[PDB]
Design a protein around this motif. Structure first.
Motif, PDB file in Angstrom:
ATOM      1  N   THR A  30       0.896  -0.955  -0.386  1.00  0.00           N
ATOM      2  CA  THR A  30       0.048   0.052   0.026  1.00  0.00           C
ATOM      3  C   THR A  30       0.972   1.210   0.017  1.00  0.00           C
ATOM      4  N   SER A  31      -0.104   2.815  -1.051  1.00  0.00           N
ATOM      5  CA  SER A  31       0.813   3.925  -0.528  1.00  0.00           C
ATOM      6  C   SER A  31       0.411   4.687  -1.089  1.00  0.00           C
ATOM      7  N   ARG A  32       0.610   5.981  -0.635  1.00  0.00           N
ATOM      8  CA  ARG A  32      -0.639   7.080  -0.562  1.00  0.00           C
ATOM      9  C   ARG A  32       0.624   8.408  -1.388  1.00  0.00           C
ATOM     10  N   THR A  33       0.591   8.275  -2.519  1.00  0.00           N
ATOM     11  CA  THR A  33       1.224   9.338  -3.690  1.00  0.00           C
ATOM     12  C   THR A  33       1.392  10.622  -2.753  1.00  0.00           C
ATOM     13  N   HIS A  34       1.361  12.331  -2.597  1.00  0.00           N
ATOM     14  CA  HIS A  34       1.631  12.828  -2.447  1.00  0.00           C
ATOM     15  C   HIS A  34       2.113  14.185  -3.025  1.00  0.00           C
ATOM     16  N   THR A  35       1.838  14.182  -4.980  1.00  0.00           N
ATOM     17  CA  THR A  35       2.470  15.225  -5.547  1.00  0.00           C
ATOM     18  C   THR A  35       2.322  16.022  -5.622  1.00  0.00           C
ATOM     19  N   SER A  36       3.111  17.158  -5.266  1.00  0.00           N
ATOM     20  CA  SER A  36       2.530  18.629  -5.155  1.00  0.00           C
ATOM     21  C   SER A  36       3.542  19.374  -6.260  1.00  0.00           C
ATOM     22  N   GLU A  37       3.531  21.168  -6.779  1.00  0.00           N
ATOM     23  CA  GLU A  37       4.616  21.500  -7.991  1.00  0.00           C
ATOM     24  C   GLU A  37       4.035  23.121  -7.597  1.00  0.00           C
ATOM     25  N   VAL A  38       5.275  23.476  -7.999  1.00  0.00           N
ATOM     26  CA  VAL A  38       5.011  24.891  -8.349  1.00  0.00           C
ATOM     27  C   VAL A  38       5.302  25.083  -9.811  1.00  0.00           C
ATOM     28  N   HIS A  39       5.217  26.315 -10.819  1.00  0.00           N
ATOM     29  CA  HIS A  39       4.900  26.178 -11.805  1.00  0.00           C
ATOM     30  C   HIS A  39       5.696  27.807 -12.059  1.00  0.00           C
ATOM     31  N   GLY A  40       6.103  28.017 -12.818  1.00  0.00           N
ATOM     32  CA  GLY A  40       6.167  30.015 -13.571  1.00  0.00           C
ATOM     33  C   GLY A  40       6.169  30.026 -15.124  1.00  0.00           C
ATOM     34  N   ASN A  41       5.264  30.528 -15.906  1.00  0.00           N
ATOM     35  CA  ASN A  41       5.406  30.523 -17.262  1.00  0.00           C
ATOM     36  C   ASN A  41       5.295  32.316 -18.148  1.00  0.00           C
ATOM     37  N   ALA A  42       5.370  32.325 -19.331  1.00  0.00           N
ATOM     38  CA  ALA A  42       5.087  33.500 -19.902  1.00  0.00           C
ATOM     39  C   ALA A  42       4.889  33.375 -21.021  1.00  0.00           C
ATOM     40  N   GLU A  43       3.849  34.205 -21.924  1.00  0.00           N
ATOM     41  CA  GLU A  43       3.804  34.347 -23.240  1.00  0.00           C
ATOM     42  C   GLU A  43       3.325  35.201 -23.419  1.00  0.00           C
ATOM     43  N   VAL A  44       3.244  35.368 -24.866  1.00  0.00           N
ATOM     44  CA  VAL A  44       3.112  36.526 -25.560  1.00  0.00           C
ATOM     45  C   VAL A  44       3.132  36.745 -27.087  1.00  0.00           C
ATOM     46  N   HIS A  45       1.620  37.200 -27.047  1.00  0.00           N
ATOM     47  CA  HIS A  45       0.972  36.686 -29.225  1.00  0.00           C
ATOM     48  C   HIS A  45       1.337  37.231 -30.020  1.00  0.00           C
ATOM     49  N   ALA A  46       1.345  37.734 -30.886  1.00  0.00           N
ATOM     50  CA  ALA A  46       2.198  38.132 -31.994  1.00  0.00           C
ATOM     51  C   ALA A  46       0.448  38.140 -32.718  1.00  0.00           C
ATOM     52  N   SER A  47       0.334  39.928 -32.918  1.00  0.00           N
ATOM     53  CA  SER A  47      -0.863  39.788 -33.940  1.00  0.00           C
ATOM     54  C   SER A  47      -0.815  41.469 -34.771  1.00  0.00           C
ATOM     55  N   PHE A  48      -1.717  41.541 -35.145  1.00  0.00           N
ATOM     56  CA  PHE A  48      -1.830  43.558 -36.436  1.00  0.00           C
ATOM     57  C   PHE A  48      -1.839  43.904 -35.364  1.00  0.00           C
ATOM     58  N   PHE A  49      -2.907  44.462 -34.438  1.00  0.00           N
ATOM     59  CA  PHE A  49      -2.678  45.325 -33.573  1.00  0.00           C
ATOM     60  C   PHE A  49      -3.012  45.071 -32.238  1.00  0.00           C
ATOM     61  N   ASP A  50      -3.054  43.627 -32.518  1.00  0.00           N
ATOM     62  CA  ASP A  50      -2.539  42.918 -30.821  1.00  0.00           C
ATOM     63  C   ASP A  50      -2.125  42.453 -30.249  1.00  0.00           C
ATOM     64  N   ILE A  51      -1.903  43.107 -29.183  1.00  0.00           N
ATOM     65  CA  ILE A  51      -0.359  42.058 -28.561  1.00  0.00           C
ATOM     66  C   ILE A  51      -1.236  41.846 -27.008  1.00  0.00           C
ATOM     67  N   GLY A  52       0.084  41.337 -26.206  1.00  0.00           N
ATOM     68  CA  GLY A  52      -0.981  41.126 -24.801  1.00  0.00           C
ATOM     69  C   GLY A  52       0.441  39.674 -24.079  1.00  0.00           C
ATOM     70  N   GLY A  53       0.484  40.006 -22.650  1.00  0.00           N
ATOM     71  CA  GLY A  53       1.784  38.973 -22.153  1.00  0.00           C
ATOM     72  C   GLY A  53       0.865  38.317 -21.231  1.00  0.00           C
ATOM     73  N   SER A  54       0.895  37.458 -21.020  1.00  0.00           N
ATOM     74  CA  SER A  54       0.124  36.205 -20.416  1.00  0.00           C
ATOM     75  C   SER A  54       1.322  34.767 -19.498  1.00  0.00           C
ATOM     76  N   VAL A  55       2.159  35.772 -18.045  1.00  0.00           N
ATOM     77  CA  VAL A  55       2.617  35.835 -17.420  1.00  0.00           C
ATOM     78  C   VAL A  55       1.478  34.815 -16.283  1.00  0.00           C
ATOM     79  N   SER A  56       2.341  33.710 -15.966  1.00  0.00           N
ATOM     80  CA  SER A  56       1.493  32.567 -14.830  1.00  0.00           C
ATOM     81  C   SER A  56       2.047  32.069 -14.193  1.00  0.00           C
ATOM     82  N   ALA A  57       1.752  31.439 -13.112  1.00  0.00           N
ATOM     83  CA  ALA A  57       2.326  30.777 -12.292  1.00  0.00           C
ATOM     84  C   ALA A  57       1.040  29.063 -11.769  1.00  0.00           C
ATOM     85  N   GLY A  58       1.310  28.078 -11.837  1.00  0.00           N
ATOM     86  CA  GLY A  58       1.171  27.094 -11.098  1.00  0.00           C
ATOM     87  C   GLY A  58       1.339  26.061  -9.929  1.00  0.00           C
TER      88      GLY A  58
END
Lengths: 49, 49
Positions: free
Chosen positions: B1-29
């Motif tokens: 028998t066993s009991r897994t407890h998997t935790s996690e941190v995260h940090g992300n950053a994305e920017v999408h390129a368009s014609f008149f559209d811009i925006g930075g999606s910086v994330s963390a999970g």
């Protein structure tokens, strides 16, 4: 034979910044996974001396 | 028998390129887990010498 049951969650974040619109969000949820795993393993072993 | 407890941190950053559209999606999970790991294993053998 393993009836391994894993119950998980979802959690993240997201923000928006632009010339016009500033927004944000947080990803959230829940999960439960189960793996009904069965298998079989054969083996030979020959030892000399 | 066993009991897994998997935790996690995260940090992300994305920017999408368009014609008149811009925006930075910086994330963390982060996503923990409450699992249950159990198994029944059988075996035979035959050692002839």
């Amino acid at each position: 034979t393993s009836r391994t049951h894993t119950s998980e969650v979802h959690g993240n974040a997201e923000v928006h910044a632009s010339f016009f619109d500033i927004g944000g969000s947080v990803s959230a949820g829940f999960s439960n996974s189960n793996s009904s795993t069965v298998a079989i393993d054969h083996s030979l072993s020959l030892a000399g001396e």
